Design a protein around this ligand. Structure first.
Ligand SMILES: CC(=O)c1ccc[n+]([C@@H]2O[C@H](COP(=O)([O-])OP(=O)(O)OC[C@H]3O[C@@H](n4cnc5c(N)ncnc54)[C@H](O)[C@@H]3O)[C@@H](O)[C@H]2O)c1
Ligand SMILES: Cc1cc2c(cc1C)N(C[C@H](O)[C@H](O)[C@H](O)COP(=O)(O)O)c1[nH]c(=O)[nH]c(=O)c1N2
Ligand code: SF4
Ligand code: FES
Ligand code: NA
Ligand code: NA
Ligand code: NA
Ligand code: NA
Ligand code: NA
Lengths: 417, 156
């Protein structure tokens, strides 16, 4: 059928796994997916025990691709030590600035995701799974609904899938404008028909999630690895990239590069290589000033030789690379990050609520040259005081990138005082 | 007395039957309502609550929480313009100026015919194609005013 218009984001791969089809900017339907051997991993998985599948995913070393890098197999193990029923949730809320990696899987190769969801659900004994997709991805929503119908037609969903005795339905829910609904407990609240308010953790979803039952939440990109692990086996999968951070990774690259888009690369790739070897260098061949890891971290031009992995000295996050060059005002950029957190705090926690607002409000004054001395001192204080009492990760990091700009670019901030 | 036109009620009922529990369909129903009316009519919220078997104040709270929903302004087409970091870097202001030249409105406003409303939004997840906007469900990179004018001409 006809889907809404989607911009044709450039995609490029050195590994030909997650982007084997999604490197082409069009919907790949089930016949094309099947032609590439699709759903044979599911068939293989259904001839294994859930425990075996968990074991393979564990030994693959797959870590969460939604930002925190939690080991996926271990998450599944935690869930299954708890009595059922259990639920499986695919987090497709992708709303962090700079981050557009998950959508190209959803919109171009939906069956890769769906196959991943079916295998994962079987692994943890979930008979009901959800995709929670942000409201601003309407095309992705329609594409997934249609793809799920295809899978049903071919007998990959429903009751007694391929004679295995395993039953599964996948429900597609839509968000409606809140970044915080990507936080897994706020996501669950939203699926339950409520406001997206994060819950105190622990308990983690794997102990108490949707309707209080064991629930696994995993990111789109995480789930899209699962068919490869089963198809290749965990040993072959672990042979991809460095053995301590194995597997393909998607890197969404934006800002002042010549070839902005999504790159599928091993995680031993350096930030400098992502920018200059793959993304074609900078616009105008201007010097790199900074890279924003979404709205999380700010790296200076002195930090470009770090690996794009989940190590202490590595890039981390979701591998989101926003490039700023020498003429980009860092304070103007910091204001945009402050505005994001201001717009997205859910307000449950007082320092988060007032801190996200005040941080943006005072930084706007600073930027426009209308800040008093008290406003300057207040901005500094507020930036350091968003985290206290916070119950989720947003309050923990709303000041993080901005603080790093204050530390790494003092001269520029000084100009504004 | 406020009643949903049958063709809307039908779609609402589909969503409500879709998930295992009725109340999980709340956001899909609200999307559908906004699609039909060009906004969320305050009067619609009571009947929706009844169909979801939720209290009215629960529904009101949900509409208030989620930024995609709009109870103020009826608009046939919502031009969602990303005002986040990458689009700002790559030319959000050029796009706003172009929209102002074609339509005669700024962010937050509706054209006098009720046809277009400009809605400033956070990162739309298309940052490589910055600066990014949506016209209802359709999404585009802004290239120039002449290009934008051609795009907008398709919405009648
Ligand atoms: N903010 C962004 O989002 C990230 C933060 O995400 P988060 O979800 O708050 O991260 P975090 O709380 O570290 O959890 C990451 C994932 O691992 C799970 N997890 C963590 N610890 C345990 C545990 N002890 N037992 C069981 N499951 C566990 C958790 O449920 C979630 O699915 C940041 O890294 C940024 O990228
Ligand atoms: C404020 C905020 C917002 C988000 C998140 C966290 C927080 C604190 N997380 C992470 C999420 O809670 C969770 O860690 C992952 O979904 C777990 O999946 P993986 O283990 O990464 O596969 C998250 N994850 C994701 O997959 N998509 C998203 O858009 C977001 N958004
Ligand atoms: S830290 Fe902020 S976003 Fe997270 S629950 Fe508290 S108020 Fe909401
Ligand atoms: S910053 Fe505009 S689409 Fe991401
Ligand atoms: Na088990
Ligand atoms: Na992140
Ligand atoms: Na069907
Ligand atoms: Na959302
Ligand atoms: Na928003």
């Amino acid at each position: 059928r006809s889907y809404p218009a989607i911009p044709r984001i450039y995609a490029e791969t050195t590994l030909n796994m997650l982007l084997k089809r999604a490197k082409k900017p069009r919907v790949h339907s089930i016949d094309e997916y099947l032609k590439d051997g699709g759903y044979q991993a599911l068939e293989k998985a259904l001839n294994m025990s859930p425990e075996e599948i968990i074991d393979w995913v564990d030994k693959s070393t797959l870590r969460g691709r939604g930002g925190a890098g939690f080991p996926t197999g271990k998450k599944w193990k935690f869930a299954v030590q708890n009595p059922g029923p259990r639920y499986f949730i695919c987090n497709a809320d992708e709303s962090e600035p700079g981050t557009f990696k998950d959508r190209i899987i959803i919109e171009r190769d939906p069956h890769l995701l769906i196959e991943g969801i079916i295998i994962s659900s079987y692994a943890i004994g979930a008979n009901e799974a959800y995709i929670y997709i942000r409201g601003e991805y309407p095309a992705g929503y329609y594409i997934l609904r249609d793809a799920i119908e295809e899978a049903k037609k071919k007998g990959f969903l429903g009751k007694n899938i391929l004679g295995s005795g395993f039953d599964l339905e996948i429900y597609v829910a839509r968000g409606a404008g809140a970044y915080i609904c990507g936080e897994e407990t706020a996501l669950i609240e939203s699926l339950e028909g409520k406001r997206g308010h994060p819950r105190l953790k622990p308990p983690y979803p794997v102990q108490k999630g949707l309707w209080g039952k064991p629930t696994v939440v995993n990111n789109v990109e995480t789930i899209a690895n699962v068919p490869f692990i089963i198809s290749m086996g965990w040993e072959e999968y672990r042979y991809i990239g460095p053995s301590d951070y194995a597997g393909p990774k998607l890197f969404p690259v934006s800002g002042k590069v010549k070839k902005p888009g999504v790159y599928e690369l091993p995680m031993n790739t350096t930030l400098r290589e992502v920018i200059f070897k793959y993304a074609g260098g900078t616009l105008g061949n201007k010097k790199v000033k900074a890279v924003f890891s979404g709205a999380l971290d700010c790296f200076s031009s002195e930090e470009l030789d770090i690996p794009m992995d989940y190590s202490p000295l590595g890039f981390g996050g979701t591998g989101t690379v926003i490039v700023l060059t020498e003429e980009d005002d860092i304070v103007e950029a910091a204001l945009k990050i402050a505005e994001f957190y201001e717009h997205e705090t859910c307000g449950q926690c007082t320092p988060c609520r007032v801190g996200c607002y005040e941080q943006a409000n005072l930084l706007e004054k600073i930027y426009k040259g209308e800040a008093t001395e008290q406003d300057w001192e207040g901005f500094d204080f507020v930036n350091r005081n968003i985290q206290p009492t916070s119950i989720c990760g947003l309050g923990a990091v709303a000041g993080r990138l901005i603080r790093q700009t204050l530390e790494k670019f003092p001269e520029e901030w000084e100009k504004y005082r | 007395e406020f009643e949903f036109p049958e063709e809307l009620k039908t779609k609402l009922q589909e969503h409500i039957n879709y998930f295992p529990k009725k109340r999980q369909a709340i956001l899909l129903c609200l999307h559908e309502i906004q699609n039909y009316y060009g906004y969320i009519p305050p009067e619609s919220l009571k009947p929706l609550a009844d169909m979801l078997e939720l209290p009215l104040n629960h529904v009101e709270g949900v509409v208030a929480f989620y930024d995609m929903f709009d109870r103020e302004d009826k608009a046939k087409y919502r031009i969602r313009v990303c005002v986040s970091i990458v689009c700002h870097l790559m030319g959000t202001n050029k796009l706003l100026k172009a929209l102002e030249n074609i339509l005669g409105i700024k962010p937050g406003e509706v054209t006098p015919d009720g046809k277009f409303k400009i809605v400033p939004v956070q990162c739309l997840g298309a940052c490589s194609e910055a600066p990014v906007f949506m016209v209802n469900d359709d999404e585009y990179k802004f290239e120039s005013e002449v290009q934008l004018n051609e795009i907008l001409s398709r919405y009648t």
